[PDB]
């Protein structure tokens, strides 16, 4: 034993327990969820209401890249928003050189060779975070979920932190219920009910909804958040359900 | 992070000694056993090579006795390997110090300069030591003949005869025994490989288990000449002192 | 100098005279523009004698360590890379013009290098001080898919022009012939001019020059 | 990523052993059987072509190396490490010698600066040290025909005949009976190959045997260093 | 026992680090194949995508390295993506150096000295991967090579790799002890995968649909991936004789 | 040197004329000035041949590693990798280069890049000693979505007045042809194009 | 201003029948003004001459540095290097400095001591190599010594042939130039015993 | 140090009642040739700026992606991008100044003279110029090279002094504006007839015309 007192040793397994380690912070973590439509993807997360004192709509956790891709992450907070930074720098140095934004499939393997690259030597600690991304490009829409690992697959519908069990149920029922697509307007009001679902298993605090999303039709193909009429109705669909 | 599995060579034990130095220098006294022997009229190295088998090509090999330049040699006791090294700076150092000053190197400036590098794996930079003892055999004409040795800690000292590697002790006493201030380098000759002769842990002390060299300014017209002897002639000078 | 290469129908044919000048004086009468780079490869040289000495052996030598590493001959695209990327880094100042001939598994090439870093590919080509008098007898003569013993003749013949027509030219004419089944390293292939020959013997009789002192010491 | 090994991983022990060192040595007695015989006009090195599967294709994986033209290099141990001590050895007889001198490094130099590489790797910060034992033999035009080993620690010593490895005890005694001042090329070639009988196990022939010579020029010189191929190995077994 | 933590030798000689790193290989519990054709060489692989929400097309370990060479990759597809990314770099930068296209077997062992140095080097871990390597190269023709975490690398006629390896191996050695060549003898790559199909189904004893597999084809100046339908269609070629 | 690149119907045609000089003397008179940085990319090279030759082939090397990651590039992309390169060493560099490419989505585009390392996306695109000739007779003569057979002609008659009035260019006119047929190369001599 | 005429000075060497020759003039100046008549330009690294035309500080700091490199050379080859080695040292090490270069004209002379083969060579200041067998010339008289040896020399001469030869070359031509002369050496060299002549000439 | 290659001339630009107007020409000069017609040098960023560019055209297409990129970078975890923490001009010009003077100290310049012209967020109009040397200046009315000698003299027979800009409307601005636009065409060798004209008002937002000509063009008297 001690295998698992630094990281990038192999156990005898063959495993890296140090990243397996990270990916219990990531389950710690509260909800947040990626939903695959049309012509594009949306983002949602659970945003845990600790207090009172905590000022509504105020502590942003969906972060943009370049201006069409979302980023939303469960976990240690601050290793996402590094991780962001570093995706920022890599979207600007592609853009910078090949003029046209960076595609999604582009993008993605940049945040994983990355993160992969924290898998490599001891003086380095794993990321602490699932991250949940994706966009429209000349393409079309897609959705990525990136591990502690440096591991990322494309995704229909993705979730993780506390609640991915419940959340990935809900995914799986979309997915089988609607093999022709399902629209922007209406992922965004599922997105609702997948974190209000999904709350049941951080159900002690009341919690704040926050959804994003880029749309070809609805947003240009730019991430914009969900805000005012449009959030108040995905809510109140989303309230219906659980009712 | 690294800091685990770091030995940390360069630090003190609660006595106050050096842990590396202390364990090189007992690798060291497993090394075959290397003599000097400095007389009025020249200087005597004598070595004891090591394990050897029948099929090893003696002629075309040097395992104990290094050229520095023409005026200085080298008997060497441990990691072969880390000699050469060491070996390699020092024939720099002369060198750099001919085309300064266009005089051949002081014997002792040299061997400062080995020691001095020596210390400093010992001081810093985390790294083992060099797990070597030299015997310097050297001519200058401010000091004469001049004997010195240094060893793994750069701890360096001047010697009229001087054993490093195995059985040291043994040999240091045999040394002190039978030398004297006036002795000659053909009697040396003698001491030095009657001392291994007897410290020895071979069954017998024959020619191909032996390297050996003399400084003499016995040369015609008053300059230095180094000889590495042949073995052949290593031979010759074991039935000539009655030990074969 | 005056040096030449062509493409025949079988392989790579390249020329060069052999005078080594400093100002107006001549250092050399024979000397070597032909350069080694690998056993199927060859550059002759013109431009600075030690720019193009000292760029053809370093390309050499890393491209017999890129062939050991490889274990397959080298390829004349290769050679022609490295001298080019190497020439252009240094921006003129390795004033090294070299014809660089070879035969590869893709059949043989001709590239013209010059000190800036740009390469021509070429069916023939022709450097250095001679080299508007050479290329007048390959603009007169040359032909596609010649024959081994005709693209010799024309490529002596154009090595010829500039040592007779220009100044810096001159001494012997050199070969080389790269083909598939082949490597010819003709030198020298032919003696345009004979050595002149001297009337008198101007040398002195023993005992002429005036001595001060004398030293003997054996070895 | 900072390199943090700074410091050395091959550290003396209380005995005055260094434990890496003799380690790497214990990885080169696994390894298979490689040897060398020194002749009067030439020098012979050979090694059994352990092919880890029979899909693989052995021609490709050279264990003798071409060092120099003159120079030919075997071993036994961890076959990566040997790999990049060959490539390191090619280009140093380059940089550090040919475009200085203009001519190959002797036998005994080239033997000498590889010896210094895997010493290196002995005592520079977080590096352990190199896995093989090698069996270099050359030829150059002052030293004449010679053969050297050079061990994990950075030693060398210079053999008539040697071998390392698996077998390497049982084979040395084998050598030093047959071994002579007055043997020609062919018959250190035919000692080579009824040494390493003893340490194969399975099949013996020109496709499990790599062999190489340092001989005479084959048509500035030719190169002295030749690989005996499939079928000259297989002439040779017949006459054994 | 911090001798088993870093790549530094244990008393027998051994590096764990590196041992345990080949265990990491068959984290994936999938099996690939490489066979020569005459014209090509083919390498198929299972597709395994357990979870319904994944992209399938998003799932694969079969890599175009340059045009001319493919790479599948048995391991963890982080260390996977971190060797085809380096591959691909090195492939390009030898082009622009030396003006022709790198062949197989030169990258192949470049990524072996590479993984080499993660072995002898302490603060780099070895990639827990098995990199097969395949090209129809223009000098050598059909070529197979493979790199592993030891830093070893070698040629192959056809090769296997995962956790049922010597099944496939010894079903492998078994037909080229038949045919007494070196190669699938096929004009057709068509044929040459059809035939790497039927070996794996009868070697595994598991019957493929289209989305159970993953083909790579290297023909003379380009390697290619076959579409789900191009790898129907030679599951229904298989199954009509 | 006398270089275009041209847009029409069915993709884009580049143009060039043979001509390398060392002041007076003609160097090459069969240059290849056409030279391809991906399938259906290519560019139209003037200025220092030591430059353009080093631009070109490091911008095939980038395209080639941008294609193993990411696809095929975009025409736009690879003259933003020129453009990059020849900005950036504005100070080193002699290089005027059109840039031309087809696209299915995008078809025929053609960027040129002048000597202040500038970009500029135009219908049709004139460069080279050359060119100032032809400014013209190109303005007067050129339709956009002409047949290719008449962008043929009108790339031949404009580089042969280019030829005719410029001693620093001279030779064959090649010219390259980009649809998504394929890659065709065309080869005019003086024989033929002299008499226009 | 030009670095390689302030100093002066002159080096030939010539080749014979098994034996060579190197010669060399004694002046050192400050352009006009004569300052040493004992600056000796030929040096020697065991059996292999080495003579050094140009800048002095140069010539010295040559000699020094190839002393440096042929000691060095001896310790780790075991011999004694050779005229055909020592050139390609000499070579390599001027155009390492190709950029800066040492403002000198050198001027190899030996023999191979294990074919018995006469060699000489000459360098320009970046180190391309003239190899020429009859004889190399070097300094600010190379043109007249050029002139003296191409009407004096022929092959195959006997070593006190070949010395009045090559000493009628120097001196001739060391006084038709203004910074060459003040005395002058001659080494006669053959493969086990090397004569060294000082000469008697005019001292203006 | 470089030289400019492909340049633009003329930016002309005033102040009014409620907002800014910024013109500049559509073409791309390669010294005396007339090379490139269809440049546009006027480049808006956000709904209340517009930075009008002289000079170098590589160096103005460096520029333009610099503040492409500065719109980007204040998205980013900015909830208030397009309301209270969206960019000003005083930002984006103050951005511009430092980048020039940084340029110029380096000695590598950006070969170009800058105004940017718009409106803050309490309806200040900003009007401001910077070039290549860092130099920095505000005015009434503003204008780059050529402009300054021409255009300004026109201009400010229309807004002389500060207390003008209240009593000068949009309509006068814009005549004021095309009216010197004209007499450049006429007078500046490296001008072109097509251009493009900007008008930043803190009521109607940014208004922004392309594809304008000069007209009414006196020639006649030339007959005589
Ligand atoms: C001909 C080249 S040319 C005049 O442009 O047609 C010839 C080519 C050549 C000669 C010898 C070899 C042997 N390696 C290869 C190629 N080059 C010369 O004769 C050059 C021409 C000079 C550079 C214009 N001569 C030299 O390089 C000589 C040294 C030779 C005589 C050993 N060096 C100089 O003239 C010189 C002068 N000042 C400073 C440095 N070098
Ligand atoms: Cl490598
Ligand atoms: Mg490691
Ligand atoms: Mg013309
Ligand atoms: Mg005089
Ligand atoms: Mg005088």
Same mark, same amino acid.
């Given at each position: 034993?001690?295998?698992?007192?630094?990281?990038?040793?192999?156990?005898?397994?063959?495993?890296?327990?140090?990243?397996?380690?990270?990916?219990?912070?990531?389950?710690?973590?509260?909800?947040?969820?990626?939903?695959?439509?049309?012509?594009?993807?949306?983002?949602?997360?659970?945003?845990?209401?600790?207090?009172?004192?905590?000022?509504?709509?105020?502590?942003?956790?969906?972060?943009?890249?370049?201006?069409?891709?979302?980023?939303?992450?469960?976990?240690?907070?601050?290793?996402?928003?590094?991780?962001?930074?570093?995706?920022?720098?890599?979207?600007?140095?592609?853009?910078?050189?090949?003029?046209?934004?960076?595609?999604?499939?582009?993008?993605?393997?940049?945040?994983?060779?990355?993160?992969?690259?924290?898998?490599?030597?001891?003086?380095?600690?794993?990321?602490?975070?699932?991250?949940?991304?994706?966009?429209?490009?000349?393409?079309?829409?897609?959705?990525?979920?990136?591990?502690?690992?440096?591991?990322?697959?494309?995704?229909?519908?993705?979730?993780?932190?506390?609640?991915?069990?419940?959340?990935?149920?809900?995914?799986?029922?979309?997915?089988?219920?609607?093999?022709?697509?399902?629209?922007?307007?209406?992922?965004?009001?599922?997105?609702?009910?997948?974190?209000?679902?999904?709350?049941?298993?951080?159900?002690?605090?009341?919690?704040?909804?926050?959804?994003?999303?880029?749309?070809?039709?609805?947003?240009?193909?730019?991430?914009?958040?969900?805000?005012?009429?449009?959030?108040?109705?995905?809510?109140?669909?989303?309230?219906?359900?659980?009712? | 992070?690294?800091?685990?599995?770091?030995?940390?060579?360069?630090?003190?034990?609660?006595?106050?000694?050096?842990?590396?130095?202390?364990?090189?220098?007992?690798?060291?006294?497993?090394?075959?056993?290397?003599?000097?022997?400095?007389?009025?009229?020249?200087?005597?190295?004598?070595?004891?090579?090591?394990?050897?088998?029948?099929?090893?090509?003696?002629?075309?090999?040097?395992?104990?006795?290094?050229?520095?330049?023409?005026?200085?040699?080298?008997?060497?006791?441990?990691?072969?390997?880390?000699?050469?090294?060491?070996?390699?700076?020092?024939?720099?150092?002369?060198?750099?110090?001919?085309?300064?000053?266009?005089?051949?190197?002081?014997?002792?400036?040299?061997?400062?300069?080995?020691?001095?590098?020596?210390?400093?794996?010992?001081?810093?930079?985390?790294?083992?030591?060099?797990?070597?003892?030299?015997?310097?055999?050297?001519?200058?004409?401010?000091?004469?003949?001049?004997?010195?040795?240094?060893?793994?800690?750069?701890?360096?000292?001047?010697?009229?005869?001087?054993?490093?590697?195995?059985?040291?002790?043994?040999?240091?006493?045999?040394?002190?025994?039978?030398?004297?201030?006036?002795?000659?380098?053909?009697?040396?000759?003698?001491?030095?490989?009657?001392?291994?002769?007897?410290?020895?842990?071979?069954?017998?002390?024959?020619?191909?288990?032996?390297?050996?060299?003399?400084?003499?300014?016995?040369?015609?017209?008053?300059?230095?000449?180094?000889?590495?002897?042949?073995?052949?002639?290593?031979?010759?000078?074991?039935?000539?002192?009655?030990?074969? | 100098?005056?040096?030449?290469?062509?493409?025949?129908?079988?392989?790579?044919?390249?020329?060069?005279?052999?005078?080594?000048?400093?100002?107006?004086?001549?250092?050399?009468?024979?000397?070597?523009?032909?350069?080694?780079?690998?056993?199927?490869?060859?550059?002759?040289?013109?431009?600075?004698?030690?720019?193009?000495?000292?760029?053809?052996?370093?390309?050499?030598?890393?491209?017999?360590?890129?062939?050991?590493?490889?274990?397959?001959?080298?390829?004349?695209?290769?050679?022609?890379?490295?001298?080019?990327?190497?020439?252009?880094?240094?921006?003129?100042?390795?004033?090294?013009?070299?014809?660089?001939?070879?035969?590869?598994?893709?059949?043989?090439?001709?590239?013209?290098?010059?000190?800036?870093?740009?390469?021509?590919?070429?069916?023939?080509?022709?450097?250095?001080?001679?080299?508007?008098?050479?290329?007048?007898?390959?603009?007169?003569?040359?032909?596609?898919?010649?024959?081994?013993?005709?693209?010799?003749?024309?490529?002596?013949?154009?090595?010829?022009?500039?040592?007779?027509?220009?100044?810096?030219?001159?001494?012997?004419?050199?070969?080389?012939?790269?083909?598939?089944?082949?490597?010819?390293?003709?030198?020298?292939?032919?003696?345009?001019?004979?050595?002149?020959?001297?009337?008198?013997?101007?040398?002195?009789?023993?005992?002429?020059?005036?001595?001060?002192?004398?030293?003997?010491?054996?070895? | 990523?900072?390199?943090?090994?700074?410091?050395?991983?091959?550290?003396?022990?209380?005995?005055?052993?260094?434990?890496?060192?003799?380690?790497?040595?214990?990885?080169?007695?696994?390894?298979?059987?490689?040897?060398?015989?020194?002749?009067?006009?030439?020098?012979?090195?050979?090694?059994?072509?352990?092919?880890?599967?029979?899909?693989?294709?052995?021609?490709?994986?050279?264990?003798?190396?071409?060092?120099?033209?003159?120079?030919?290099?075997?071993?036994?141990?961890?076959?990566?490490?040997?790999?990049?001590?060959?490539?390191?050895?090619?280009?140093?007889?380059?940089?550090?010698?040919?475009?200085?001198?203009?001519?190959?490094?002797?036998?005994?130099?080239?033997?000498?600066?590889?010896?210094?590489?895997?010493?290196?790797?002995?005592?520079?910060?977080?590096?352990?040290?190199?896995?093989?034992?090698?069996?270099?033999?050359?030829?150059?035009?002052?030293?004449?025909?010679?053969?050297?080993?050079?061990?994990?620690?950075?030693?060398?010593?210079?053999?008539?005949?040697?071998?390392?490895?698996?077998?390497?005890?049982?084979?040395?005694?084998?050598?030093?009976?047959?071994?002579?001042?007055?043997?020609?090329?062919?018959?250190?070639?035919?000692?080579?190959?009824?040494?390493?009988?003893?340490?194969?196990?399975?099949?013996?022939?020109?496709?499990?045997?790599?062999?190489?010579?340092?001989?005479?020029?084959?048509?500035?010189?030719?190169?002295?260093?030749?690989?005996?191929?499939?079928?000259?190995?297989?002439?040779?077994?017949?006459?054994? | 026992?911090?001798?088993?933590?870093?790549?530094?030798?244990?008393?027998?000689?051994?590096?764990?680090?590196?041992?345990?790193?080949?265990?990491?290989?068959?984290?994936?519990?999938?099996?690939?194949?490489?066979?020569?054709?005459?014209?090509?060489?083919?390498?198929?692989?299972?597709?395994?995508?357990?979870?319904?929400?994944?992209?399938?097309?998003?799932?694969?370990?079969?890599?175009?390295?340059?045009?001319?060479?493919?790479?599948?990759?048995?391991?963890?597809?982080?260390?996977?993506?971190?060797?085809?990314?380096?591959?691909?770099?090195?492939?390009?930068?030898?082009?622009?150096?030396?003006?022709?296209?790198?062949?197989?077997?030169?990258?192949?062992?470049?990524?072996?000295?590479?993984?080499?140095?993660?072995?002898?080097?302490?603060?780099?871990?070895?990639?827990?991967?098995?990199?097969?390597?395949?090209?129809?190269?223009?000098?050598?023709?059909?070529?197979?090579?493979?790199?592993?975490?030891?830093?070893?690398?070698?040629?192959?006629?056809?090769?296997?790799?995962?956790?049922?390896?010597?099944?496939?191996?010894?079903?492998?050695?078994?037909?080229?002890?038949?045919?007494?060549?070196?190669?699938?003898?096929?004009?057709?790559?068509?044929?040459?995968?059809?035939?790497?199909?039927?070996?794996?189904?009868?070697?595994?004893?598991?019957?493929?649909?289209?989305?159970?597999?993953?083909?790579?084809?290297?023909?003379?100046?380009?390697?290619?991936?076959?579409?789900?339908?191009?790898?129907?269609?030679?599951?229904?070629?298989?199954?009509?004789? | 040197?006398?270089?275009?690149?041209?847009?029409?119907?069915?993709?884009?045609?580049?143009?060039?004329?043979?001509?390398?000089?060392?002041?007076?003397?003609?160097?090459?008179?069969?240059?290849?000035?056409?030279?391809?940085?991906?399938?259906?990319?290519?560019?139209?090279?003037?200025?220092?041949?030591?430059?353009?030759?080093?631009?070109?082939?490091?911008?095939?090397?980038?395209?080639?590693?941008?294609?193993?990651?990411?696809?095929?590039?975009?025409?736009?992309?690879?003259?933003?990798?020129?453009?990059?390169?020849?900005?950036?060493?504005?100070?080193?560099?002699?290089?005027?280069?059109?840039?031309? =490419? *087809?696209? !299915? +989505? %995008?078809?025929? /585009?053609?960027?040129?890049?002048?000597?202040?390392?500038?970009?500029? &996306?135009?219908?049709?695109?004139?460069?080279?000693?050359?060119?100032?000739?032809?400014? =013209? *007779?190109? !303005? +007067? %003569?050129?339709? /956009?979505?002409?047949?290719?057979?008449?962008?043929?002609?009108?790339? &031949?008659?404009?580089?042969?007045?280019?030829?005719?009035?410029?001693?620093?260019?001279? =030779?064959?006119?090649?010219?390259?042809?980009?649809?998504?047929?394929?890659?065709?190369?065309?080869?005019?001599?003086?024989?033929?194009?002299?008499?226009? | 201003?030009?670095?390689?005429?302030?100093?002066?000075?002159?080096?030939?060497?010539?080749?014979?029948?098994?034996?060579?020759?190197?010669?060399?003039?004694?002046?050192?100046?400050?352009?006009?003004?004569?300052?040493?008549?004992?600056?000796?330009?030929?040096?020697?690294?065991?059996?292999?001459?080495?003579?050094?035309?140009?800048?002095?500080?140069?010539?010295?700091?040559?000699?020094?540095?190839?002393?440096?490199?042929?000691?060095?050379?001896?310790?780790?080859?075991?011999?004694?290097?050779?005229?055909?080695?020592?050139?390609?040292?000499?070579?390599?090490?001027?155009?390492?400095?190709?950029?800066?270069?040492?403002?000198?004209?050198?001027?190899?002379?030996?023999?191979?001591?294990?074919?018995?083969?006469?060699?000489?060579?000459?360098?320009?200041?970046?180190?391309?190599?003239?190899?020429?067998?009859?004889?190399?010339?070097?300094?600010?008289?190379?043109?007249?010594?050029?002139?003296?040896?191409?009407?004096?020399?022929?092959?195959?001469?006997?070593?006190?042939?070949?010395?009045?030869?090559?000493?009628?070359?120097?001196?001739?031509?060391?006084?038709?130039?203004?910074?060459?002369?003040?005395?002058?050496?001659?080494?006669?060299?053959?493969?086990?015993?090397?004569?060294?002549?000082?000469?008697?000439?005019?001292?203006? | 140090?470089?030289?400019?290659?492909?340049?633009?001339?003329?930016?002309?630009?005033?102040?009014?009642?409620?907002?800014?107007?910024?013109?500049?020409?559509?073409?791309?000069?390669?010294?005396?040739?007339?090379?490139?017609?269809?440049?546009?040098?006027?480049?808006?960023?956000?709904?209340?700026?517009?930075?009008?560019?002289?000079?170098?055209?590589?160096?103005?297409?460096?520029?333009?992606?610099?503040?492409?990129?500065?719109?980007?970078?204040?998205?980013?975890?900015?909830?208030?991008?397009?309301?209270?923490?969206?960019?000003?001009?005083?930002?984006?010009?103050?951005?511009?100044?430092?980048?020039?003077?940084?340029?110029?100290?380096?000695?590598?310049?950006?070969?170009?003279?800058?105004?940017?012209?718009?409106?803050?967020?309490?309806?200040?109009?900003?009007?401001?110029?910077?070039?290549?040397?860092?130099?920095?200046?505000?005015?009434?009315?503003?204008?780059?090279?050529?402009?300054?000698?021409?255009?300004?003299?026109?201009?400010?027979?229309?807004?002389?002094?500060?207390?003008?800009?209240?009593?000068?409307?949009?309509?006068?601005?814009?005549?004021?504006?095309?009216?010197?636009?004209?007499?450049?065409?006429?007078?500046?060798?490296?001008?072109?007839?097509?251009?493009?004209?900007?008008?930043?008002?803190?009521?109607?937002?940014?208004?922004?015309?392309?594809?304008?000509?000069?007209?009414?063009?006196?020639?006649?008297?030339?007959?005589?």
């Amino acid at each position: 034993t001690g295998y698992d007192l630094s990281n990038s040793v192999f156990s005898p397994d063959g495993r890296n327990f140090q990243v397996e380690y990270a990916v219990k912070a990531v389950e710690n973590g509260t909800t947040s969820i990626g939903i695959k439509c049309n012509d594009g993807v949306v983002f949602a997360v659970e945003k845990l209401i600790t207090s009172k004192l905590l000022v509504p709509q105020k502590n942003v956790k969906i972060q943009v890249v370049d201006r069409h891709i979302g980023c939303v992450y469960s976990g240690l907070i601050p290793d996402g928003r590094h991780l962001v930074n570093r995706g920022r720098e890599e979207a600007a140095s592609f853009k910078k050189l090949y003029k046209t934004p960076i595609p999604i499939p582009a993008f993605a393997d940049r945040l994983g060779q990355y993160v992969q690259a924290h898998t490599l030597y001891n003086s380095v600690r794993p990321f602490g975070v699932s991250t949940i991304f994706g966009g429209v490009d000349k393409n079309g829409a897609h959705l990525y979920m990136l591990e502690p690992s440096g591991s990322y697959w494309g995704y229909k519908g993705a979730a993780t932190g506390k609640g991915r069990q419940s959340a990935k149920a809900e995914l799986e029922k979309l997915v089988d219920h609607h093999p022709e697509g399902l629209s922007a307007r209406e992922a965004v009001k599922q997105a609702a009910k997948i974190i209000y679902l999904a709350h049941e298993d951080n159900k002690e605090k009341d919690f704040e909804l926050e959804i994003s999303w880029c749309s070809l039709s609805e947003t240009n193909g730019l991430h914009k958040f969900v805000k005012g009429d449009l959030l108040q109705e995905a809510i109140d669909f989303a309230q219906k359900e659980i009712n | 992070g690294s800091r685990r599995y770091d030995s940390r060579t360069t630090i003190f034990s609660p006595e106050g000694r050096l842990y590396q130095v202390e364990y090189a220098l007992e690798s060291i006294s497993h090394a075959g056993t290397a003599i000097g022997i400095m007389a009025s009229d020249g200087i005597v190295l004598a070595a004891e090579r090591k394990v050897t088998s029948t099929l090893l090509e003696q002629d075309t090999s040097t395992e104990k006795l290094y050229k520095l330049n023409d005026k200085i040699a080298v008997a060497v006791a441990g990691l072969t390997a880390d000699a050469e090294i060491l070996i390699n700076t020092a024939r720099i150092h002369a060198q750099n110090y001919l085309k300064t000053y266009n005089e051949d190197i002081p014997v002792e400036i040299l061997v400062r300069r080995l020691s001095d590098i020596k210390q400093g794996y010992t001081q810093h930079g985390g790294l083992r030591p060099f797990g070597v003892s030299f015997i310097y055999a050297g001519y200058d004409d401010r000091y004469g003949y001049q004997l010195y040795t240094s060893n793994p800690s750069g701890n360096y000292t001047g010697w009229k005869a001087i054993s490093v590697g195995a059985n040291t002790s043994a040999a240091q006493t045999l040394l002190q025994m039978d030398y004297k201030d006036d002795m000659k380098v053909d009697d040396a000759i003698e001491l030095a490989l009657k001392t291994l002769s007897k410290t020895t842990d071979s069954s017998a002390l024959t020619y191909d288990r032996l390297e050996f060299a003399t400084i003499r300014k016995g040369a015609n017209d008053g300059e230095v000449y180094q000889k590495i002897f042949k073995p052949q002639e290593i031979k010759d000078i074991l039935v000539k002192t009655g030990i074969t | 100098t005056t040096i030449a290469g062509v493409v025949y129908k079988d392989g790579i044919v390249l020329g060069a005279d052999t005078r080594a000048t400093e100002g107006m004086v001549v250092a050399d009468k024979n000397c070597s523009k032909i350069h080694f780079i690998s056993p199927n490869i060859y550059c002759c040289g013109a431009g600075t004698a030690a720019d193009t000495d000292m760029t053809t052996q370093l390309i050499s030598s890393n491209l017999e360590l890129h062939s050991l590493s490889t274990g397959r001959l080298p390829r004349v695209v290769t050679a022609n890379r490295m001298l080019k990327q190497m020439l252009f880094r240094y921006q003129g100042y390795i004033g090294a013009a070299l014809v660089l001939g070879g035969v590869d598994v893709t059949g043989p090439h001709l590239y013209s290098i010059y000190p800036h870093g740009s390469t021509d590919k070429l069916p023939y080509v022709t450097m250095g001080s001679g080299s508007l008098a050479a290329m007048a007898v390959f603009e007169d003569k040359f032909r596609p898919d010649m024959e081994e013993e005709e693209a010799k003749n024309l490529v002596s013949e154009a090595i010829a022009a500039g040592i007779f027509n220009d100044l810096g030219s001159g001494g012997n004419i050199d070969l080389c012939v790269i083909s598939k089944n082949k490597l010819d390293f003709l030198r020298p292939y032919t003696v345009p001019n004979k050595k002149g020959t001297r009337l008198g013997r101007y040398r002195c009789e023993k005992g002429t020059t005036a001595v001060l002192t004398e030293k003997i010491t054996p070895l | 990523m900072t390199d943090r090994y700074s410091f050395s991983l091959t550290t003396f022990s209380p005995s005055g052993k260094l434990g890496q060192i003799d380690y790497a040595l214990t990885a080169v007695k696994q390894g298979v059987t490689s040897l060398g015989i020194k002749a009067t006009n030439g020098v012979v090195i050979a090694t059994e072509k352990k092919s880890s599967s029979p899909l693989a294709m052995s021609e490709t994986l050279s264990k003798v190396s071409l060092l120099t033209p003159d120079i030919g290099a075997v071993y036994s141990g961890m076959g990566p490490d040997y790999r990049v001590l060959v490539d390191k050895s090619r280009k140093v007889a380059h940089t550090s010698y040919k475009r200085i001198y203009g001519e190959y490094p002797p036998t005994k130099l080239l033997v000498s600066e590889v010896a210094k590489i895997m010493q290196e790797a002995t005592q520079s910060g977080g590096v352990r040290p190199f896995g093989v034992s090698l069996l270099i033999a050359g030829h150059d035009e002052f030293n004449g025909f010679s053969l050297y080993q050079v061990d994990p620690s950075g030693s060398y010593f210079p053999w008539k005949a040697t071998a390392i490895g698996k077998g390497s005890v049982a084979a040395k005694t084998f050598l030093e009976k047959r071994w002579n001042d007055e043997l020609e090329l062919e018959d250190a070639i035919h000692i080579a190959l009824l040494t390493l009988k003893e340490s194969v196990e399975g099949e013996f022939n020109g496709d499990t045997i790599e062999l190489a010579i340092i001989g005479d020029e084959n048509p500035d010189k030719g190169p002295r260093f030749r690989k005996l191929t499939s079928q000259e190995i297989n002439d040779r077994l017949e006459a054994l | 026992g911090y001798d088993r933590h870093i790549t530094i030798f244990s008393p027998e000689g051994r590096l764990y680090q590196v041992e345990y790193a080949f265990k990491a290989t068959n984290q994936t519990n999938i099996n690939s194949l490489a066979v020569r054709g005459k014209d090509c060489t083919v390498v198929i692989s299972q597709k395994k995508v357990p979870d319904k929400l994944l992209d399938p097309t998003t799932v694969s370990y079969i890599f175009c390295i340059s045009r001319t060479i493919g790479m599948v990759v048995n391991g963890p597809i982080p260390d996977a993506r971190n060797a085809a990314l380096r591959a691909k770099a090195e492939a390009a930068e030898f082009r622009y150096k030396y003006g022709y296209d790198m062949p197989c077997d030169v990258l192949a062992k470049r990524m072996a000295n590479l993984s080499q140095i993660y072995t002898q080097r302490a603060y780099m871990r070895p990639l827990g991967v098995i990199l097969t390597f395949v090209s129809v190269d223009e000098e050598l023709g059909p070529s197979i090579y493979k790199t592993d975490p030891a830093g070893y690398y070698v040629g192959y006629k056809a090769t296997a790799t995962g956790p049922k390896q010597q099944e496939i191996t010894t079903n492998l050695e078994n037909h080229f002890k038949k045919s007494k060549i070196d190669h699938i003898n096929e004009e057709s790559w068509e044929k040459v995968v059809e035939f790497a199909i039927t070996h794996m189904i009868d070697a595994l004893g598991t019957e493929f649909s289209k989305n159970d597999l993953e083909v790579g084809v290297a023909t003379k100046d380009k390697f290619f991936t076959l579409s789900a339908e191009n790898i129907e269609e030679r599951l229904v070629a298989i199954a009509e004789q | 040197t006398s270089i275009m690149a041209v847009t029409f119907k069915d993709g884009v045609i580049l143009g060039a004329d043979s001509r390398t000089t060392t002041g007076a003397y003609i160097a090459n008179r069969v240059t290849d000035k056409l030279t391809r940085v991906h399938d259906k990319i290519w560019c139209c090279r003037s200025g220092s041949a030591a430059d353009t030759q080093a631009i070109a082939d490091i911008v095939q090397y980038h395209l080639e590693l941008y294609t193993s990651q990411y696809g095929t590039p975009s025409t736009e992309t690879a003259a933003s990798v020129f453009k990059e390169l020849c900005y950036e060493n504005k100070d080193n560099l002699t290089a005027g280069i059109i840039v031309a =490419g *087809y696209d !299915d +989505k %995008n078809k025929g /585009e053609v960027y040129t890049i002048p000597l202040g390392g500038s970009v500029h &996306k135009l219908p049709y695109a004139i460069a080279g000693s050359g060119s100032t000739f032809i400014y =013209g *007779y190109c !303005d +007067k %003569n050129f339709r /956009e979505n002409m047949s290719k057979e008449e962008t043929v002609d009108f790339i &031949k008659h404009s580089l042969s007045q280019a030829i005719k009035w410029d001693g620093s260019s001279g =030779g064959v006119i090649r010219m390259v042809v980009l649809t998504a047929a394929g890659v065709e190369r065309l080869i005019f001599y003086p024989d033929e194009y002299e008499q226009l | 201003s030009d670095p390689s005429s302030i100093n002066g000075g002159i080096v030939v060497a010539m080749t014979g029948k098994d034996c060579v020759a190197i010669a060399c003039d004694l002046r050192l100046g400050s352009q006009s003004l004569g300052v040493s008549n004992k600056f000796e330009k030929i040096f020697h690294y065991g059996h292999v001459f080495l003579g050094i035309t140009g800048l002095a500080t140069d010539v010295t700091t040559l000699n020094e540095m190839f002393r440096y490199k042929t000691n060095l050379y001896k310790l780790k080859e075991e011999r004694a290097i050779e005229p055909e080695t020592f050139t390609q040292l000499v070579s390599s090490s001027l155009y390492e400095r190709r950029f800066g270069p040492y403002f000198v004209g050198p001027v190899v002379a030996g023999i191979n001591s294990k074919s018995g083969k006469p060699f000489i060579a000459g360098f320009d200041l970046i180190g391309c190599i003239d190899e020429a067998k009859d004889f190399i010339v070097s300094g600010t008289a190379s043109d007249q010594l050029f002139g003296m040896c191409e009407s004096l020399y022929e092959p195959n001469l006997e070593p006190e042939d070949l010395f009045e030869t090559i000493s009628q070359a120097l001196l001739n031509a060391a006084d038709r130039d203004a910074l060459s002369g003040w005395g002058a050496v001659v080494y006669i060299i053959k493969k086990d015993e090397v004569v060294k002549r000082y000469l008697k000439m005019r001292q203006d | 140090t470089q030289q400019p290659i492909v340049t633009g001339t003329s930016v002309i630009s005033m102040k009014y009642d409620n907002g800014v107007i910024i013109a500049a020409d559509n073409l791309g000069s390669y010294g005396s040739l007339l090379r490139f017609n269809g440049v546009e040098r006027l480049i808006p960023v956000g709904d209340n700026t517009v930075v009008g560019i002289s000079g170098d055209i590589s160096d103005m297409q460096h520029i333009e992606r610099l503040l492409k990129d500065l719109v980007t970078e204040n998205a980013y975890d900015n909830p208030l991008a397009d309301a209270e923490e969206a960019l000003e001009p005083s930002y984006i010009f103050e951005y511009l100044a430092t980048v020039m003077y940084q340029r110029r100290s380096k000695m590598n310049p950006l070969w170009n003279a800058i105004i940017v012209a718009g409106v803050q967020s309490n309806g200040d109009q900003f009007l401001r110029y910077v070039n290549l040397l860092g130099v920095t200046y505000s005015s009434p009315t503003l204008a780059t090279g050529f402009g300054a000698h021409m255009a300004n003299p026109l201009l400010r027979k229309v807004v002389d002094r500060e207390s003008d800009i209240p009593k000068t409307t949009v309509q006068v601005a814009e005549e004021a504006i095309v009216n010197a636009m004209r007499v450049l065409y006429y007078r500046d060798a490296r001008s072109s007839r097509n251009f493009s004209l900007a008008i930043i008002d803190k009521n109607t937002g940014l208004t922004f015309k392309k594809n304008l000509q000069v007209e009414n063009m006196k020639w006649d008297f030339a007959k005589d």
